[PDB]
From Swiss-Prot, chains A, C:
It comes from Homo sapiens (Human). Residues 16-51 are annotated as: Stalk region. Constitutes the soluble short form (S-OPA1) generated by cleavage by OMA1, which plays a central role in mitochondrial inner membrane fusion and cristae morphology. The transmembrane long form (L-OPA1) and the S-OPA1 form higher-order helical assemblies that coordinate the fusion of mitochondrial inner membranes. Inner membrane-anchored L-OPA1 molecules initiate membrane remodeling by recruiting soluble S-OPA1 to rapidly polymerize into a flexible cylindrical scaffold encaging the mitochondrial inner membrane. It is found in: Mitochondrion intermembrane space. It comes from the Eukaryota. This is Dynamin-like GTPase OPA1, short form. The chain holds residues 859 to 909 of 960 of the full protein.
Length: 51, 51, 51
């Protein structure tokens, strides 16, 4: 239950801030990787060829 | 009659209430069955009157 | 209705969100009435006695 997390009734009830944390950093790492890749393939590789 | 006219309510309440009211609304989280039932009760009452 | 949200089942029409609104409004009515009472009983009622 993600809903049990949403409940946040008590510690004994599921308190899954941990899953949402690791999800957030999942997003951070994936988006960082794709941004770096995009700059590489559309900006830096052509500059590399020129150099 | 006279005692009423010599009294005035402190208008600043309008601003304080604005904060306080928001806070009471701000809790959108029904964490357990008891508050779920209280919530359904008030919703049923308010909607039944208009119905 | 609680199982649907544990399972995230896709064919589930039922989503119980109006309940939160009327829960919030019930609690806001309580908070506004209580704040007004406190202003009455500690500030305004004694001013009324003086007047």
């Amino acid at each position: 239950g993600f809903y049990y997390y949403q409940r946040h009734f008590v510690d004994s009830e599921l308190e899954c801030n941990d899953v949402v944390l690791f999800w957030r950093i999942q997003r951070m790492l994936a988006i960082t990787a794709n941004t770096l890749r995009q700059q590489l393939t559309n900006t830096e590789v052509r500059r590399l060829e020129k150099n | 009659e006279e005692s009423i006219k010599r009294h005035k309510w402190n208008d600043f309440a309008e601003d304080s209430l604005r904060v306080i009211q928001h806070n009471a609304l701000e809790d959108r989280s029904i964490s357990d069955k008891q508050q779920w039932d209280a919530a359904i009760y008030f919703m049923e009452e308010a909607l039944q009157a208009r119905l």
